[PDB]
């Protein structure tokens, strides 16, 4: 799930660029620019911190957020970089939506273009939004926004019509996670009512045959490079990273690390990992997912123990990860092995990285922690 899949052998290392705590409240929404070298930072304080890699890295007096705009209000926990739309969509608790051309402040110190497109979505049907993704094809600009309350619809950034709607997955209920096909094939929605749901991208056909029966929360989505009919997802509890065959609609993949047994009914381990990043390389998918255990996760399938990851906990001997084959699939069990705490001290959720034979990665916590790893 990344352009120019890299060669095998990806392992992490102990380098970083900068750290920030500017966001007064928790930050749970970031956007990474495509045409440029910048990424967006927003916080539960209803304020968004814009950070430019070129400037924020160093060689400057202060690496403060370039574009800090709080006119949205509420809690800003929804942001996205519109695909070739020269607009940035932002969402806040108060059922409102914004699509601003804040890039207007690039060269001079001038007011950032307020939301070129904005809307206060229905408080009951959609609230403001739970999901929002824009589709770019040059000729048309279509962005798809989902709300926590079961509802899925798209909004063309260059069109007034908003008929692109997906009938609420009522059985799915909660709508807080969705997956996207790389070629606009189909979408899957991460929910928490136990059941899961999938959507098509050609005809937007609703396909609800996925689930984690325990009524578990699933907010993580990436396209499983292993099978176009397979997807990559992360769910809360037991440090779960599983791949689900949505035809069966259940996850069949593991890195088992949890007090809970595999697919444990009680899930004795409530810890999990999220913010997964997908790319095909080294004979299997190569992923970097935010480990809610604060385990900076550079994850491997064939040799998870053998490879190297960005996580901490130096007290653990050489990386320990179990590789198995279970009922037609290879199963993995993840097993564990003055000063100042370098690692984040909050519930880390977001990760973003850039490199070319070398580069940097961005990390954050559940309160505003900023970790810019090199």
């Amino acid at each position: 799930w990344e352009s120019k899949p890299p060669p095998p052998g990806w392992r992490p290392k102990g380098l970083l660029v900068a750290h920030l705590h500017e966001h007064k409240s928790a930050v749970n929404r970031i956007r990474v620019s495509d045409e440029h070298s910048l990424f967006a930072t927003c916080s539960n304080d209803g304020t968004v911190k814009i950070w430019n890699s070129q400037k924020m890295e160093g060689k400057t007096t202060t690496t403060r957020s370039i574009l800090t705009y709080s006119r949205i209000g509420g809690r800003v926990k929804t942001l996205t970089f519109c695909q070739g739309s020269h607009y940035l969509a932002i969402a806040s608790d108060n059922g409102a939506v914004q699509l601003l051309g804040i890039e207007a402040s690039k060269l001079p110190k001038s007011p950032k273009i307020h939301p070129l497109q904005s809307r206060i979505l229905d408080q009951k049907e959609d609230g403001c939004v739970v999901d929002m993704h824009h589709f770019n094809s040059g000729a048309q600009s279509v962005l798809a926004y989902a709300t926590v309350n079961g509802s899925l619809v798209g909004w063309d950034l260059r069109s007034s019509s908003n008929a692109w709607t997906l009938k609420h997955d009522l059985k799915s209920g909660l709508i807080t996670s969705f997956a996207v096909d790389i070629h606009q094939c189909w979408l899957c929605i991460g929910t928490s009512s136990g059941t899961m749901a999938c959507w098509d991208m050609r005809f937007q056909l609703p396909i609800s045959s996925h689930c984690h029966p325990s009524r578990a929360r699933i907010r993580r989505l990436s396209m499983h490079p292993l099978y176009q009919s397979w997807v990559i997802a992360a769910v809360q509890g037991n440090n779960e990273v599983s791949m689900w065959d949505m035809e069966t609609g259940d996850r069949r993949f593991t890195l088992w690390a949890s007090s809970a047994p595999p697919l444990s009914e009680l899930q004795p381990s409530p810890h999990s990992v999220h913010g997964i990043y997908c790319s095909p390389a080294d004979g299997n998918p190569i992923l970097l997912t935010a480990g809610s255990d604060m385990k900076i996760r550079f994850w491997d399938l064939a040799y998870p123990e053998r490879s190297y990851v960005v996580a901490g906990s130096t007290s653990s001997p050489s990386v320990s990860y179990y590789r198995k084959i279970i009922e037609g699939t290879e199963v993995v069990q993840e097993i564990q092995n003055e000063s100042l705490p370098v690692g984040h001290h909050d519930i880390i959720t977001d990760v973003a990285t850039f490199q070319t034979t070398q580069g940097f990665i961005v990390t954050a916590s559940r309160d505003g922690i900023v970790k810019v790893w090199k």
């Binding site: 705590h21 500017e22 690496t63």
Partner: peptide, 4 residues
């Protein structure tokens, strides 16, 4: 903090 405030990065002035």
């Amino acid at each position: 903090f405030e990065v002035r």
